[PDB]
Amino acid sequence: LAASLACAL
């Protein structure tokens, strides 16, 4: 989940 937020942004 944490990585998905950073990736998206």
Coordinates of N, CA and C in Angstrom, one line a residue:
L1 N 0.8 -1.2 0.0 CA 0.0 0.0 0.0 C 0.8 1.3 0.0
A2 N 1.9 1.4 0.9 CA 2.7 2.6 1.0 C 3.3 2.9 -0.4
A3 N 3.9 1.8 -1.0 CA 4.6 2.0 -2.3 C 3.6 2.5 -3.4
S4 N 2.3 2.0 -3.3 CA 1.3 2.3 -4.3 C 1.0 3.8 -4.3
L5 N 1.0 4.4 -3.1 CA 0.8 5.8 -2.9 C 1.9 6.6 -3.5
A6 N 3.1 6.3 -3.2 CA 4.3 7.0 -3.7 C 4.4 6.8 -5.3
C7 N 4.1 5.6 -5.8 CA 4.1 5.4 -7.2 C 3.1 6.3 -7.9
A8 N 1.9 6.3 -7.5 CA 0.8 7.0 -8.1 C 1.2 8.5 -8.2
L9 N 1.8 9.0 -7.2 CA 2.2 10.4 -7.1 C 3.5 10.8 -7.7

